[PDB]
C-alpha cells in the first residue's frame, strides 16, 4: 500500500475537500468521529482505503489531508462542522488576510509568509507514510489563494518531493458564479507557473457544473453546496481506484501512464452520467449503453467543448454499480458506429475499463438520486483546448489596456511575467492544434 496526501487551497479547494471527505467516509463506512466499525485491524493496516486514511490507536481514521487558506472563515467552518473530530488541528492552516483575488498577492506577498509553515505540516503527514506516491491538489484558477499560493506550493513540492507525482483538481472560472473580474489573469498566471509541476490536471468548469444542476437537478439558482456535491461525485469516481481493490489506476503514476502521453497536454476531460434528481418521483433506471452513450454528449462534460472536432489520445471508463464487461463492449460497439471518435494516428483506438460493483454513494438529503449504475469517462481529447482559447481571449482583452496590472506590480510582480505566462499559453494552444488538427 502507498499513501496519498490531499491538499486543499483557498475557498474552492477547502469546500470541495469537505464534500469529497464527507463522501469518502460514507463510501468506506467511516463516522464523523473517525470510527470505522468495519475495520478489524485496529491502529494500523495496509488496506486500499489506508491510501487516504491513517489510523490511531483509539480506532480513529484520520484523512491524509491538509487544508490551507490565507483567511480563516472557510476553514473555521470545518473546525466546527459536522466532521470537526475527523481532522487533527495541525492539518488545518489559516492566515488573517487573504490574497484579495490577486495572484501576485497570494504567490509573493502573503504566500511567502506561510509557505514554510505549510510545508512543515505537509512534512508531518508525509513522515507517517511508509511509501508516499504523491499529492492531490484541490484549488481554483480564479482565487488569489487558489491560484497564487498553489503555484508557489507546487514549486516547492517538486523540490522536497522530486520523485512524487502530483495531480490537480482545478476549478475553471465561470462568470455565473465568479467573484472577481481579474480571474482570467490569475488563471493564466497560475497555469504557466504550475504547468511543469503537475503530472495530471482535471479541469472542472463551473459553467458546466452550473448548467448540469439547472438542467438535470431542477435547481433554478445552484449554490456552491449543490456544485460541490456533484463535483465530489466525479472526484470520487476518479479516486475510487486508489481507495478500493482493483487493477486499473492503482497508483498516481498509472494516471499519467494511461491518460497523459505528452507531459504538457495533461488535461483530461471528465464526463459523468447519470445525474438524476432526488426530487424526481418517477424515474426509469438507465442501462449501460444509455449511460455510456451519455459520456459523448457535451452536456454531461466537466468542460463544455466539442470532442468531435478534436482527437483522442486516451480514454478510460470507470463504472460504478451493476455493470459487466459484456454489456460494456456491446455499448462501445454501437457508439463507435454512430459518433465521431478520432484517435491520433500514433495511439491505439481503444478504451481502458474499470468496474466497481458498489453503486454510487449519495449523501443523505442531497440533490442527487440513487442510481443502479453510473460511469465516469476520462478522455484526453484535444477539444479541451477550447477552454484555453476562451481563457486566453479574455486575458488578451484586458492586458491590451494593461487593466488591473498595477495591482499585481504593486505586489512585487513584474509586468513581464504576464506576457511570459501568456507566451506559454500560446505555446500550449499550439501543441493542441498540432496533435488534433
Amino acid at each position: 500500500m502507498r499513501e496519498c496526501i490531499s491538499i486543499h487551497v483557498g475557498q474552492a479547494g477547502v469546500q470541495i475537500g469537505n464534500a469529497c471527505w464527507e463522501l469518502y467516509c460514507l463510501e468506506h463506512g467511516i463516522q464523523p468521529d473517525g470510527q470505522m466499525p468495519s475495520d478489524k485491524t485496529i491502529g494500523g493496516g495496509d488496506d486500499s482505503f489506508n491510501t487516504f486514511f491513517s489510523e490511531t490507536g483509539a480506532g480513529k481514521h484520520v484523512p491524509r489531508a491538509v487544508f490551507v487558506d490565507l483567511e480563516p472563515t472557510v476553514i473555521d467552518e470545518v473546525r466546527t462542522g459536522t466532521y470537526r473530530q475527523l481532522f487533527h488541528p495541525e492539518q488545518l492552516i489559516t492566515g488573517k488576510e487573504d490574497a484579495a483575488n490577486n495572484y501576485a498577492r497570494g504567490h509573493y506577498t502573503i504566500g511567502k509568509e506561510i509557505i514554510d509553515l505549510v510545508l512543515d505540516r505537509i512534512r508531518k503527514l508525509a513522515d507517517q507514510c511508509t511509501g508516499l506516491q504523491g499529492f492531490l491538489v484541490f484549488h481554483s484558477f480564479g482565487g488569489g489563494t487558489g491560484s497564487g499560493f498553489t503555484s508557489l506550493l507546487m514549486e516547492r513540492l517538486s523540490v522536497d518531493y522530486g520523485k512524487k507525482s502530483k495531480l490537480e483538481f482545478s476549478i475553471y472560472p465561470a462568470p455565473q458564479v465568479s467573484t472577481a473580474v481579474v480571474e482570467p489573469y490569475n488563471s493564466i498566471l497560475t497555469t504557466h507557473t504550475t504547468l511543469e509541476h503537475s503530472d495530471c490536471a482535471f479541469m472542472v468548469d463551473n459553467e458546466a457544473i452550473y448548467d448540469i444542476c439547472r438542467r438535470n437537478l431542477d435547481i433554478e439558482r445552484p449554490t456552491y453546496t449543490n456544485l460541490n456535491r456533484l463535483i465530489s461525485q466525479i472526484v470520487s469516481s476518479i479516486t475510487a481506484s486508489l481507495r478500493f481493490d482493483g487493477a486499473l489506476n492503482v497508483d498516481l503514476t498509472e494516471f499519467q501512464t494511461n491518460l497523459v502521453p505528452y507531459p504538457r497536454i495533461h488535461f483530461p476531460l471528465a464526463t459523468y452520467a447519470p445525474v438524476i434528481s432526488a426530487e424526481k418521483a418517477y424515474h426509469e433506471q438507465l442501462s449501460v449503453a444509455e449511460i455510456t452513450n451519455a459520456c459523448f454528449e457535451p452536456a454531461n462534460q466537466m468542460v463544455k467543448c466539442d470532442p468531435r472536432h478534436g482527437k483522442y489520445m486516451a480514454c478510460c471508463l470507470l463504472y460504478r454499480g451493476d455493470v459487466v464487461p459484456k454489456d460494456v463492449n456491446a455499448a462501445i460497439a454501437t457508439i463507435k458506429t454512430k459518433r465521431s471518435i478520432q484517435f491520433v494516428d500514433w495511439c491505439p483506438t481503444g478504451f481502458k475499463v474499470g468496474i466497481n460493483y458498489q453503486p454510487p454513494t449519495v449523501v443523505p438529503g442531497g440533490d442527487l438520486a440513487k442510481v443502479q449504475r453510473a460511469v465516469c469517462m476520462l478522455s484526453n481529447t484535444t477539444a479541451i483546448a477550447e477552454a484555453w482559447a476562451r481563457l486566453d481571449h479574455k486575458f488578451d482583452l484586458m492586458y491590451a489596456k494593461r487593466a488591473f496590472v498595477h495591482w499585481y506590480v504593486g505586489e512585487g510582480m513584474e509586468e513581464g511575467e504576464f506576457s511570459e505566462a501568456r507566451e506559454d499559453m500560446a505555446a500550449l494552444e499550439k501543441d493542441y492544434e498540432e496533435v488534433g488538427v
Binding site: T179, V181, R221, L397, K401, F404, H406, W407
Partner: protein, 427 residues
C-alpha cells in the same frame, strides 16, 4: 477585518452621524449601545464597524473631527450621540472658515496629531485592519482641507491599508461660499493620489433628486442627507453582512479600479424615497434594475450615456428571486452593451442580501466606475477657472502661506484626470 471610520467637518459629521444612525438600526443597536435585535445576521460581521465593550455593548469604531465644537456638539446631543466613544471626539475652537488652507496648513495642522493619536489607539486594538473610510465635503475647510491632511498622514503611517472616502461635491445650487470650487479642486488633487476608492456624492444630484423626483420645492441639508445615508447603507452592505459575496475594502478596490487614478464611483439608489413619506407598493425586480441604472437615481450629476462603464457593482436587498435578479442584470448588459467597455469581460457583479433597509421591503444600490464622472470634474474645473483667471478670492489662501503656483498645479492635475477618463471612453 475592522474598518476605522472618520468624519471631518460639518458635512462629514452630519452625514456621518446619520450613517451610524441608519446602520445601527439595521444591526439592531439602540442609542445606548445595547443590541436588541432578532436575527443573528446582524451580529456575524458586526466587528467590521463596531467594537465590543464592557457589558456586551457595541461602540462604533468612529472618530469625530472638526475645528469647531458647533456641529460636534449637535452630534453629541443627537439621537445616537451617546453611542460614540467620548474620547474619539477631537475638536478645535477657531474653525476653518470654509478655507482649504486653514484646514490643511495652519489651523488643521495644530489638531492633526491628536486625531492620529485616536486613530492609532483604534488601529492597535484591531485584529486585522482593512483600512479607513472618511466622510467629508470638499467645499468647506475642515473636512476638505484637514480631511485630506489626515488622509496624507494616515497613508504615511499605514501605507498598506485601504483608504476609502465618501466625498460630497459642492454645487452652486446648494452653495455656502464662492470659494467652494477652490477647495474642491485642491481636495480632488489629494484624493487622486492618496485614496483607493472615492464615492462621488454630488450635492447637485442630491438637489435635483429632491426637486425633480421627490417633489420637494425647497430641500434642506436634512433632505439631502437622507439620500446620502441610504446610499452609504447600501454600498457598505456587503461589508457588514454575510452572503456569497463576503467582501472587504481591498477586494472592492481590486475589482473596481482597473487604473489607480480612476477610482471615483457614481453611487446609485432605488427606489428613491423622501423623508417622512412612505410609499406602499414594493418594486418588482425589473423595476429595481431599471431605476438603479437610471441617471435620475445617480448621486453624481453625470449622464452615464455620455460615457462608458468600466466596472459596475450592484447590491439587491430584500426577499426576491435571485434568478430574476440574474436575468434582469443580464438583460441590462445585453440590451446596452455599448455602454460597457468590451476590454473588461464580465465587469458587472451582483450581490444579494436578505435584510432590507428600514422602511423598504426591496432596494437596489448601484456603484459605477464610469468615464462619465469626468463631467463632475469638468464642472468644477470651469467654476475654478472662472475665478482663478482673475485671481479672485485668492487672498484668503495666500494669507495662510499658499502660492498661486499650488493652485495652478491642482488645476492641472484635475484636467489630467479628466483627459485620462476621456482616454478610455474613446478606446
Amino acid at each position: 477585518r475592522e474598518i476605522v471610520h472618520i468624519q471631518a467637518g460639518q458635512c462629514g459629521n452630519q452625514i456621518g452621524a446619520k450613517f451610524w444612525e441608519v446602520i445601527s438600526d439595521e444591526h439592531g443597536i439602540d442609542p445606548t449601545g445595547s443590541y436588541h435585535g432578532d436575527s443573528d445576521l446582524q451580529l456575524e460581521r458586526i466587528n467590521v464597524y463596531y467594537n465590543e465593550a464592557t457589558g456586551n455593548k457595541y461602540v462604533p469604531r468612529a472618530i469625530l473631527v472638526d475645528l469647531e465644537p458647533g456641529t460636534m456638539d449637535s452630534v453629541r446631543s443627537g439621537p445616537f450621540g451617546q453611542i460614540f466613544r467620548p474620547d474619539n471626539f477631537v475638536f478645535g475652537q477657531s474653525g476653518a472658515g470654509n478655507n482649504w488652507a486653514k484646514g490643511h496648513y495652519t489651523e488643521g495642522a495644530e489638531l492633526v496629531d491628536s486625531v492620529l493619536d485616536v486613530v492609532r489607539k483604534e488601529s492597535e486594538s484591531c485584529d486585522c485592519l482593512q483600512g479607513f473610510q472618511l466622510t467629508h465635503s470638499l467645499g468647506g475647510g475642515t473636512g476638505s482641507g484637514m480631511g485630506t491632511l489626515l488622509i496624507s498622514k494616515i497613508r504615511e503611517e499605514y501605507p498598506d491599508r485601504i483608504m476609502n472616502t465618501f466625498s460630497v461635491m459642492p454645487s452652486p445650487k446648494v452653495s455656502d461660499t464662492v470659494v467652494e470650487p477652490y477647495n474642491a479642486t485642491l481636495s480632488v488633487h489629494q484624493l487622486v493620489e492618496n485614496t483607493d476608492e472615492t464615492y462621488c456624492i454630488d450635492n447637485e444630484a442630491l438637489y435635483d433628486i429632491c426637486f425633480r423626483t421627490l417633489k420637494l420645492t425647497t430641500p434642506t441639508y436634512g433632505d439631502l442627507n437622507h439620500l446620502v445615508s441610504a446610499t452609504m447603507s447600501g454600498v457598505t452592505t456587503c461589508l457588514r453582512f454575510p452572503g456569497q459575496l463576503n467582501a472587504d475594502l481591498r477586494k472592492l478596490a481590486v475589482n473596481m479600479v482597473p487604473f489607480p487614478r480612476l477610482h471615483f464611483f457614481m453611487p446609485g439608489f432605488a427606489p428613491l424615497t423622501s423623508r417622512g413619506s412612505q410609499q406602499y407598493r414594493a418594486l418588482t425586480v425589473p423595476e429595481l434594475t431599471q431605476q438603479m441604472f437610471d441617471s435620475k437615481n445617480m448621486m453624481a450629476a453625470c449622464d452615464p450615456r455620455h460615457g462608458r462603464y468600466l466596472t459596475v457593482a450592484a447590491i439587491f436587498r430584500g426577499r426576491m428571486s435571485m434568478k430574476e435578479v440574474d436575468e434582469q442584470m443580464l438583460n441590462v448588459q445585453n440590451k446596452n452593451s455599448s455602454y460597457f467597455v468590451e476590454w473588461i469581460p464580465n465587469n458587472v457583479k451582483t450581490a444579494v442580501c436578505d435584510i432590507p433597509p428600514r422602511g423598504l421591503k426591496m432596494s437596489a444600490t448601484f456603484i459605477g466606475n464610469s468615464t462619465a464622472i469626468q463631467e463632475l470634474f469638468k464642472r468644477i474645473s470651469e467654476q475654478f477657472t472662472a475665478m482663478f483667471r482673475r485671481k479672485a478670492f485668492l487672498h484668503w489662501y495666500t494669507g495662510e502661506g499658499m502660492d498661486e503656483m499650488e493652485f495652478t498645479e491642482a488645476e492641472s492635475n484635475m484636467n489630467d484626470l479628466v483627459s485620462e477618463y476621456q482616454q478610455y471612453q474613446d478606446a
